[PDB]
User: Which sequence fits this backbone?
C-alpha cells in the first residue's frame, strides 16, 4: 500500500517518490540529496512547513497521496 | 523535464 509524494526543490523541479506508510523518510531525503549531489543534511525537508526527521514516516505525519514536501537549503549562521 | 518517480 503505497502513496506517491511530490518533492519540490528550490528551483521548482519535482521528483516523485512512491513510499509505504511505514517507510522511514530518511530514505526519501537521502535519495533526493543523492540525485542533487549534496549531503542529505545540507538540506531541510518540510511538510506543511515542519521539518521531516529521519525516522518520521508518512503515517506519523498523516501524509496522503500527492502530498507535497518542500526542500530548502539548510539555514546558516 | 520528464516525470521522475522513484520507488522506495
Assistant:
Amino acid at each position: 500500500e503505497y502513496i506517491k509524494l511530490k518533492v519540490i526543490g528550490q528551483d521548482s523541479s519535482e521528483i516523485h517518490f512512491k513510499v509505504k506508510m511505514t517507510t522511514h523518510l530518511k530514505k526519501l531525503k537521502e535519495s533526493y540529496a543523492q540525485r542533487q549531489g549534496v549531503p542529505m543534511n545540507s538540506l531541510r525537508f518540510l511538510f506543511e512547513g515542519q521539518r521531516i526527521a529521519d525516522n518520521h514516516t508518512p503515517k506519523e505525519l498523516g501524509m496522503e497521496e500527492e502530498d507535497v514536501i518542500e526542500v530548502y537549503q539548510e539555514q546558516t549562521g | 523535464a520528464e516525470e521522475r518517480i522513484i520507488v522506495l
Notes: Helices of chain A lie at 26-36, 58-61. Chain A touches chain B at residues 2, 4, 13-20, 23, 27-28, 31 (CB under 8 Å). The longest strand of chain A covers residues 2-8. DSSP finds two helices and five strands in chain A.
